[PDB]
Structure formats: structure tokens, C-alpha cells
Paper text:
ParMs generally exist on low-copy number plasmids where they contribute to plasmid segregation and stable inheritance.
Dh-cParM1 forms single and tightly coupled double filaments and is highly conserved on the chromosomes of five of six Desulfitobacterium species. From a total of 2845 images and a final selection of 71,060 particles, a 4.0 Å resolution density map of a Dh-cParM1 single filament constructed from two parallel strands was reconstructed displaying a helical rise and twist of 24.5 Å and 156.03°, respectively. Its short helical repeat is about half that of F-actin or ParM-R1 resulting in a more twisted structure. As observed for other ParM protomers, the analogous subdomain 2 region to the DNase I binding loop in actin was clearly observed in the density as well as the characteristic ParM closed beta-barrel in subdomain 1. Due to the limited resolution, we cannot unambiguously determine the state of the nucleotide bound in this structure. However, ADP appears to fit better into the cryoEM density map than ATP, which is consistent with polymerization initiating hydrolysis of ATP. The hydrophobic residues of subdomain 2 interact with the hydrophobic pocket of subdomains 1 and 3 of the upper subunits in a ball and socket manner, similar to that observed in pCBH ParM. The maps from class 2 with GTP (30 min) and the third condition (GTP, 1 min) were similar to each other, although the resolution was limited, suggesting that they were in the state before the phosphate release. The helical twists for Cb-cParM and Dh-cParM1 protofilaments were different, ∼167° compared to ∼156°, respectively, with Cb-cParM being more similar to ParM-R1 (∼165°).
Author numbering: 1 to 369
The structure:
């Protein structure tokens, strides 16, 4: 790695989960935020058991004050998986692409970088990616916003105390699916590794949480918007279906289940589709894989609507994101690859791009900074 521990790090392909690649270490948690309170009653030992294997795997157990050090203002958050399990009435996914407003939407990534950073203060060069259709109209705003000094104070577990500071030197922003293509085509040190991916046509898919995003790479180049686009049918649309089916499985009761997506996401993350109830369990997995039969069909049709003129030419369809593991058997393409370590595909490519933009000839000193 580099001769100074400034983070070269790539991350926030986040609407379902912030995820972040910093080389030998990685951060991952669901993108749930709450403007948390003192935890005063619920701090009791009554269920306060830790199950983690590292400080890294203390991820998502996050209880913080975040400070915009560049402006001297501060806010208190429960962040990630903890917030599913403190304020389930008021904790929510942050849900807009724009981060010019919404310091909340930046705070998730600020916390993730502070978890990644091993030592109390350092500088960072950042890679990240907005969803594909926005890259024509949004990247410059992130390249202004997502910069300068931040700090995080922590109260839970191995993180506790330790009021870390970090400074983003500068950020490189890319269209979200491109990170997958990058991590598949390039070595750690930016050398290309298989011309089989460069020549002819490749299609690359993040079947993501808020959105499913698709880009066509021809001869090594991402093609322009009518060939590389974005689709509102992300996993959250399937949970909106599962919620109506769970409601119609409990409308027969005197007061029906009325879950927002967050509880279904919890139920698939934590305990494999068994929604908790009297007599122990309601099992959603039949309903869920009935929905992902729909969503995988629809991602295939929403693709073919814009790509069918090209369809015969395609070497392969790359699939990424957590939902890649959930949908991949159902997508209607003859040559099709689920990329290695599916979760991080966008983030890893953003790190590899950040390494390019933190050479001395791109942005570093000749000295250690
Ligand atoms: N730590 C985790 N444990 C289990 N499932 C996870 C975890 N992190 C993310 N997922 C789940 O994967 C889905 C999000 O997929 P993701 O690739 O992160 O979508 P996106 O890139 O578009 O934001 C959600 O259901 C989310 O809860
Ligand atoms: Mg995604």
C-alpha cells in the first residue's frame, strides 16, 4: 500500500447499505438513520449482548455525535443496525440522491469513514458513485459538498470515546455501476487483467435497493444515456409488495401488520424471513421469492426495452450488489456473471479509481501528505 496511511477509500453505493472499501479493511451497514436520544431506559443490560468478531464487525452498532468540523455544527445519531433496534417508529432510510441539502445523507458516509480509519486523525482521498442517470447533472455538487474536515464521537462498544477526525482531500465521483466494471477489469494497482471484458459489448447491473442501475460498456467505454440508465424497480419495490402480501396474510386478524420496508429488511438480514408473531413465526420466504421472481423478470424486461437492439452482441451481463445474490438465477440472459464478493463491487472500483487520483501527478505531495 501507500507509504502514508491517508485513506485511499471507495464507498457509498448506499441506499440499502453504506458500504466502503479501504483495502485490507471494509465497512458495511444498512443505511438507516435516527436523530437519537439519550438511550436512558433502553441502555439496560436486559438484552445488551454483543456478538461481533472484530471492531470492524462492531459495524452498524453505531451511536454517535457527528460534527461538520468545516462549519462548527453537531448532531446526535443512532446509525445503521442499532437504529433498527432503538427507534423503529422514527428511524428511516435516507432517500434522496442530492447531498447539497441533507447533511443526514452525508453523515452515514462520514461515520463509515471514521469506522474505517484506524488511527485518531488522518486525511482521505474518496471514491464514490451517484446512481447512473444522475451523473450528467449531479457529480459536481458532490465534488463540492463531500470534502473537508469531519469528526465523530462514539458511545458504543469497541468504538467508544475515541473522537476521531478525518479530512477528505478531494473526492472522485463516478456513475454507480462503473465501479463493478472497474473492479472486474483492473488489478489493485490499476493494470488491466482480461481484454475479454474490454472488447465488444458488456452490460453491467446493480439490481440495487432504491434503484436498479444498468450501463453498457462497448470496447471498454461506458455508452451514453439511452444505453446506460436507471430503473425505479429496486429491492424496496419488492418489499412494498411483500408488505401488502403480509397485510393480506393478517387482515383476517383484528388489527393487521403494517410494516414499513425497514422491518422486512431487518427480517431478511437478522433471521431469514421469519417475521416474529404469536406461535413464534410467520414465514415470508415463499412470498419473498414469489416477489423476486417478479422483480428479476422485470429487471430483465426493463433492460430489454432499451437494450434489445444490441442484445445479440453482448459478451456477458455482470451482476453486482447484495440483491445480485438474491435475483441472479431469474435474470433472462444467456451469458451472465455474478461478480466476486458481490456487495462491494461499486465501492472496490471506486477505491481503485481513488488510488489513480492520489498519485503525486494527480493529487498528492511528493512528501508523505
Ligand atoms: N450486513 C448485511 N447483512 C445482511 N444483509 C445486508 C447487509 N448489508 C446489506 N444487506 C442487504 O442487502 C440489500 C441492499 O443491497 P445493496 O447492494 O446494498 O443495495 P444498494 O447498493 O443499491 O444500496 C438490503 O436488503 C440490505 O439490508
Ligand atoms: Mg446499489
Amino acid at each position: 500500500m501507500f507509504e502514508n496511511d491517508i485513506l485511499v477509500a471507495g464507498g457509498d453505493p448506499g441506499f440499502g447499505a453504506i458500504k466502503l472499501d479501504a483495502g485490507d479493511t471494509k465497512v458495511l451497514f444498512p443505511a438507516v438513520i435516527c436523530k437519537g436520544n439519550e438511550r436512558i431506559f433502553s441502555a439496560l443490560g436486559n438484552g445488551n449482548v454483543s456478538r461481533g468478531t472484530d471492531e470492524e464487525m462492531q459495524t452498524g452498532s453505531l451511536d454517535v455525535i457527528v460534527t461538520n468540523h468545516s462549519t462548527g455544527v453537531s448532531r446526535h445519531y443512532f446509525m445503521g443496525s442499532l437504529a433498527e433496534s432503538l427507534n423503529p417508529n422514527e428511524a428511516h432510510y435516507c432517500w434522496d440522491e442530492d447531498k447539497s441539502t441533507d447533511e443526514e445523507a452525508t453523515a452515514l458516509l462520514v461515520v463509515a469513514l471514521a469506522v474505517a480509519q484506524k488511527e485518531p486523525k488522518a486525511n482521505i482521498y474518496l471514491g464514490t458513485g451517484v446512481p447512473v442517470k444522475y451523473y450528467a447533472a449531479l457529480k459536481d455538487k458532490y465534488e463540492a459538498e463531500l470534502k473537508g474536515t469531519w469528526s465523530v464521537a462514539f458511545r458504543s462498544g469497541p468504538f467508544k470515546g475515541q473522537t476521531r477526525q478525518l479530512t477528505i482531500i478531494r473526492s472522485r465521483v463516478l456513475p454507480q455501476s462503473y465501479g463493478v466494471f472497474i473492479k472486474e477489469t483492473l488489478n489493485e494497482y490499476g493494470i488491466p487483467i482480461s481484454p475479454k471484458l474490454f472488447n465488444g459489448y458488456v452490460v453491467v447491473i446493480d439490481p440495487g435497493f432504491r434503484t436498479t442501475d444498468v450501463a453498457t460498456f462497448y470496447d471498454g467505454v461506458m455508452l451514453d444515456p439511452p444505453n446506460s440508465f436507471s430503473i425505479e424497480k429496486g429491492l424496496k419495490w419488492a418489499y412494498t409488495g411483500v408488505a401488502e402480501q403480509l397485510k393480506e396474510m393478517t387482515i383476517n386478524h383484528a388489527n393487521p401488520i403494517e410494516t414499513d420496508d425497514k422491518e422486512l429488511d431487518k427480517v431478511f438480514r437478522v433471521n431469514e424471513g421469519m417475521y416474529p408473531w404469536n406461535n413464534g413465526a410467520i414465514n415470508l420466504n415463499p412470498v419473498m421469492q414469489d416477489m423476486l421472481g417478479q422483480l428479476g423478470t422485470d429487471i430483465s424486461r426493463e433492460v430489454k426495452k432499451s437494450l434489445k437492439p444490441m442484445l445479440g452482441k453482448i459478451h456477458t451481463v455482470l451482476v453486482a450488489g447484495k440483491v445480485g445474490e438474491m435475483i441472479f438465477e431469474h435474470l433472462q440472459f444467456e451469458n451472465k456473471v455474478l461478480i466476486e464478493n458481490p456487495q462491494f463491487g461499486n465501492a472496490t472500483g471506486f477505491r481503485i479509481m481513488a488510488a489513480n487520483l492520489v498519485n503525486n501527478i494527480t493529487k498528492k505531495a511528493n512528501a508523505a501528505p
